[PDB]
Amino acid sequence: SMSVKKPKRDDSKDLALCSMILTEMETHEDAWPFLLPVNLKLVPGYKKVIKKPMDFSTIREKLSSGQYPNLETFALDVRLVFDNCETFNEDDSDIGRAGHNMRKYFEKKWTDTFK
């Protein structure tokens, strides 16, 4: 509350560390469904069904231009990429499986880097 603060967690490396995580996501072999925005002209249903499209290139541009106020807003956009994938793709598909694998990969890097 006013003039009563919890001890200051060091957040000065968060930007660099989120960039490293995102690099590792970009270079994973199952990243290919997620590297670029879904083409809304060429994928029937996507525009109407997926209210907030997100992809790694879009996260990379937001990261690079100071559009994440903190590390939690960054994790929300990464998770959105996988939540979107699960909304649109059967679990038993190459893309569905890719999404589950990437989410698992991300969540471990996240816990190990920050928790």
From Swiss-Prot:
Domain of life of the organism encoding this protein: Eukaryota
UniProt subcellular location: Nucleus
Domain Bromo intervals: 9-113
Tissue: Expressed at varying levels in several tissues, whereas a smaller transcript was expressed specifically in testis.
Biological role: Regulatory subunit of the ATP-dependent BRF-1 and BRF-5 ISWI chromatin remodeling complexes, which form ordered nucleosome arrays on chromatin and facilitate access to DNA during DNA-templated processes such as DNA replication, transcription, and repair. Both complexes regulate the spacing of nucleosomes along the chromatin and have the ability to slide mononucleosomes to the center of a DNA template. The BRF-1 ISWI chromatin remodeling complex has a lower ATP hydrolysis rate than the BRF-5 ISWI chromatin remodeling complex.
Family: Belongs to the WAL family.
Quaternary structure and interacting proteins, as annotated: Component of the BRF-1 ISWI chromatin remodeling complex, at least composed of SMARCA1 and BAZ2B, which regulates the spacing of histone octamers on the DNA template to facilitate access to DNA. Within the BRF-1 ISWI chromatin remodeling complex interacts with SMARCA1; the interaction is direct. Component of the BRF-5 ISWI chromatin remodeling complex, at least composed of SMARCA5/SNF2H and BAZ2B, which regulates the spacing of histone octamers on the DNA template to facilitate access to DNA.
The protein's name in its UniProt record: Bromodomain adjacent to zinc finger domain protein 2B
Native species: Homo sapiens (Human)
